[PDB]
Amino acid sequence: TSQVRQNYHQDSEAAINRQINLDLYASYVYLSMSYYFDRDDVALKNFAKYFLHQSHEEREHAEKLMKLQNQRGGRIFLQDIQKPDCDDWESGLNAMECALHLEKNVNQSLLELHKLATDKNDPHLCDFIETHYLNEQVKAIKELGDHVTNLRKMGAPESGLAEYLFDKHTLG
Template identity: 85%
Template sequence: MTTAPPSQVRQNYHQDLEAAVNHQINLELYASYVYLSMSYYFNRDDVALKDFAKYFLHQSHEEREHAEKLMKLQNQRGGRVFLQDIQKPDHDDWESGLNAMQCSLLELHKLATDKNDPHLCDFIETHYLNEQVKSIKELGSACILGFPLPFL
């Protein structure tokens, strides 16, 4: 089996970062898969929590978009996208899987900082970390104050 030649647009993109971005892509797809499972659980006729179903479906779409942004970044930087198997969601332990994904973003940011890659640091901050803070605040306000979420 022959390997593909290195990309002609690859510039200043460390292999460790390429591997970490591929890992993050897998985690984003996993999160999308978990949210999709949760959405259709809450949409069942015996559960019938339609607003929860809408919320988690929206989150599933957002996580898939995150994965797609990372794939686009990988191509722009001259890296290669290597998709991996997506782990089956464990419906008894939703929190730990999503928490792991959030921690992974921080690790990816730290690795990008260590490898002196300001472009990747900025990308992660702009498209992921700030959005997570906003989503947590939005969901918390809606739950505490009874405000509707913008997509419900």
């Protein structure tokens, strides 16, 4: 047992390792999305930039969880980072829809982690999740919903003009 460990259940430790993997996976999804928009036959530079920023943010989320693991005296166990489900993300609108689904999945995992921390009477872990993760997710989900709505209302994905203008006026 770590000399620092206190009130940290093995189930919590395992759940944190799963969440580290999930955040790394989300980083990889967004990396894949970014460079899709960098293709010469897609060529939406601000979609590419937006998703690349998202990728780096998700990696930061994972690193903060790794720091948390060690702070609490848990032991980090890394797993493979699965390749994303898609190689081709179709359109700006489809990528945004996929991102919205991803962020809702990450939120679900975080809510399950918070329930576990509550069940194990770990108020430090509860606070960590609330403070650093839950409002971040609510904001991310709202932003992506807003993007999806605008792209749909403008006439995406069929209107390449809509995605072009959204790239310039919202993401640029």
